């Protein structure tokens, strides 16, 4: 609905309700995660190498290719599996 | 503004245990290129002229 003559002052900088918006999005983000799986048994020693690529020596690989151990559906069997990762997710533990 | 990643990717499902799925990144079919973004030249220069003015 529109109004005539009445004139009010506003201030974006001490305005409220933005604070509760920044609260609410964080709370919605956290509520959208607890029904999903944890990734605890994944922190394990990774055997890694370079992906198959004709690499110039001065350039670095953006993809690393790693293999490791993981528990199967049972508790007794364990299997060897491989995957890909970016360089910004693995670091060097400290021959091989 | 356009942005794109061109590398074709294949997901893969490892099982952790009873009823737990986990998604790796499998094979890569194609050449390894680099994901990037494009914008137009003259529109960007003209809008920067606007904000300078």
């Amino acid at each position, epitope marked *: 609905i529109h109004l005539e003559n009445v004139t009010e002052e506003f201030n974006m900088w001490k305005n409220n309700m933005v604070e509760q918006m920044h609260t609410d999005i964080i709370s919605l983000w956290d509520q959208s995660l607890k029904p999903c799986v944890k990734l605890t048994p994944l922190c394990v020693t990774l055997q890694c190498t370079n992906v*198959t*690529n*004709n690499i110039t020596d001065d350039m670095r690989g953006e993809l690393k290719n790693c293999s490791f151990n993981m528990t199967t559906e049972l508790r007794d069997k364990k299997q060897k599996v491989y995957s890909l990762f970016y360089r910004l997710d693995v670091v060097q533990i400290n021959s091989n | 503004i356009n942005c794109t990643r*061109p590398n074709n990717n294949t997901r893969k499902s490892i099982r952790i245990g009873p009823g737990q799925a986990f998604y790796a990144t499998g094979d890569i*079919i*194609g*050449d*390894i*290129r*680099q994901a*990037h973004c494009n914008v137009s030249k003259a529109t960007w220069n003209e809008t920067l002229g606007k904000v300078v003015k």
Partner: antibody, heavy 132, light 103 residues
Framework: QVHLQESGPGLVKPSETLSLTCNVS????????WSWIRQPLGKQPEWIGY???????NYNPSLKSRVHLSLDKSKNLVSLRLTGVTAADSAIYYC??????????????????????????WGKGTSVTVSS | VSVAPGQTARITCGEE??????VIWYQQRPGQAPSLIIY??????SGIPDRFSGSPGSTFGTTATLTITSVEAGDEADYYC????????????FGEGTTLIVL
């Protein structure tokens, strides 16, 4: 019109320095990327390498140390030197010219492209046999 | 590898494709010097005849072919592929020969 000529001694003692020369016709040695090619009987031929002025002299990383390609701008020839030829290098040899080119797939500025070569014209060949 | 005269034969050579590749096809008559046929994937130099079908380079996970149509007795030549992939290093040796035995 162009044609070439392989030339070599042919009978080399084991562990010895081999040399080879390649004669030109018409097109001078400055113009073209040159190449040497080795082939034994019933085998795929082996690209020994390519040579040109201004550092365009990348070699085969198989041998890479005991072999020296070179040119001859005075007499307009193509020269090959080896060192320590053993019994494995019994083959016929070929000099050639080549034409290069660009293959481009992705972004140009990010070096997502490479160069290729192909040897257009061939020489005659020389049956170098290493023997004691 | 044998077909009737005037026909088309199918000739493949080398590894499966990985990325964008550039292929080179060379031929060689016996006793003589080597010789070019196809320099890009489907391009041939001037002075060379047609009817030599090559493969496109965009297809991934395939094998490079070479189809000869309207064959003859003069086409009896040892063939050599030379692949260049954008993922594998530089092949300093040539591919395996596929000798044709014409009818």
């Amino acid at each position: 019109q162009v044609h070439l000529q392989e030339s070599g001694p042919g009978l080399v003692k084991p562990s010895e320095t081999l040399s080879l020369t390649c004669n030109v016709s018409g097109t001078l040695v400055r113009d073209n990327y040159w190449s040497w090619i080795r082939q034994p009987l019933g085998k795929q031929p082996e690209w020994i390498g390519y040579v040109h002025d201004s550092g365009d002299t990348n070699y085969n990383p198989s041998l890479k140390s005991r072999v020296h390609l070179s040119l001859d701008k005075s007499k307009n020839l193509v020269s090959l030197r080896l060192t320590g030829v053993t019994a494995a290098d019994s083959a016929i040899y070929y000099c050639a010219t080549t034409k290069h080119g660009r293959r481009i797939y992705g972004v140009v500025a990010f070096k997502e492209w490479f160069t290729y070569f192909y040897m257009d014209v061939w020489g005659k060949g020389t049956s170098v046999t290493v023997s004691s | 590898v044998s077909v009737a005269p005037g026909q088309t034969a199918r000739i493949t050579c080398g590894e499966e494709s990985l990325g964008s590749r550039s292929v080179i096809w060379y031929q060689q008559r016996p006793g003589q010097a080597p010789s070019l046929i196809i320099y890009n994937n489907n391009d041939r130099p001037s002075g060379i005849p047609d009817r030599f079908s090559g493969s496109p380079g965009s297809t991934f996970g395939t094998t490079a072919t070479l189809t000869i149509t309207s064959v003859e007795a003069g086409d009896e030549a040892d063939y050599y592929c030379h692949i260049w992939d954008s993922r594998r290093p530089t092949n300093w040796v040539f591919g395996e020969g596929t000798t044709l035995i014409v009818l």
